[PDB]
Ligand binder design. Structure first.
Ligand SMILES: C[C@@H](NC(=O)[C@@H]1C[C@H]2C[C@H]2N1C(=O)Cn1nc(C(N)=O)c2ccncc21)c1cccc(Cl)c1F
Length: 225
């Protein structure tokens, strides 16, 4: 997260770190007892999910690392595109829920949110241009950027489909390692940080997030498998 601040520890109990050989790979979001939603491009290394965490490195009572029974990339995702950029990770078992570990309800109405709606993105992604990686969860409050402005020639030039949304990227932004993490608006999961490479912190190139409501049938179908 560029230009953010350290998040209050365990105040987002749905935040997950998707890990590869015990190193942070992507954000994720606990959406069901046994399921973490993330981004398609995040993923034969050992993939785990860390829940209840603030620090990646430090012992915390709430911290628990879950093996993953199944990784289910969206079957229409493709490298070289950020369409359908979701990933569902079935944990080994139902996560132990408590104050620091709780599923986040996700948006089912497939309608756009208000322009400028202040949403919250958290992650363990890079925090500056040199690539400094934070130990502790960061977050940033970002206003939603309407899709029309996001698609202007000087911006993302028509690339933003109705299944995607944008937020402002003006020095504050998601960045590398934030992919797969939550964009939370009005207390509900609205979007998932995309996981294609993109410039961070450039106000002319907004952050892109996948609209979970647009993918309800997919999510429902995979969570009930
Ligand atoms: C392990 C490795 N993880 C990744 O590269 C993940 C894993 C794989 C999906 C792709 N990834 C991304 O981040 C993709 N991505 N998304 C955004 C975005 N939306 O702004 C972005 C902007 C710029 N470049 C890549 C970007 C990592 C390297 C260094 C530090 C950290 Cl903290 C870290 F996690």
């Amino acid at each position: 997260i560029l230009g953010g601040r350290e998040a209050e520890a365990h105040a987002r109990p749905y935040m997950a770190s998707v890990q590869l050989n015990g190193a942070h790979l992507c954000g994720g979001v606990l959406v069901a007892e046994q399921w973490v939603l993330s981004a398609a491009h995040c993923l034969d290394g050992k993939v785990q999910v860390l829940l209840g965490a603030h620090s990646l490195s430090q012992p915390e009572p709430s911290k628990r690392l879950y093996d993953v029974l199944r990784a289910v990339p969206h079957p229409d995702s493709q490298p070289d595109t950020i369409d359908h950029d979701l990933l569902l990770l079935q944990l080994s078992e139902k996560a132990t829920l408590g104050p620091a570990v709780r599923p986040l309800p996700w948006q089912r109405v497939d309608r756009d949110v208000a322009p400028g709606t202040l949403c919250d993105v958290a992650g363990w992604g890079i925090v500056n241009h040199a690539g400094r990686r934070p130990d502790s969860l960061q977050h940033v409050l970002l206003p939603v950027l309407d899709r029309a402005t996001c698609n202007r020639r000087t911006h993302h030039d028509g690339a933003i489909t109705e299944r995607l949304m944008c937020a402002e990227s003006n020095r504050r932004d998601s960045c590398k390692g934030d992919s797969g993490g939550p964009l939370v608006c009005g207390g509900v999961l609205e979007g998932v940080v995309t996981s294609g490479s993109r410039v961070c912190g450039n106000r002319k190139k907004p952050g892109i997030y996948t609209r979970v409501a647009s993918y309800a049938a997919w999510i429902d179908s995979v969570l009930a498998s």
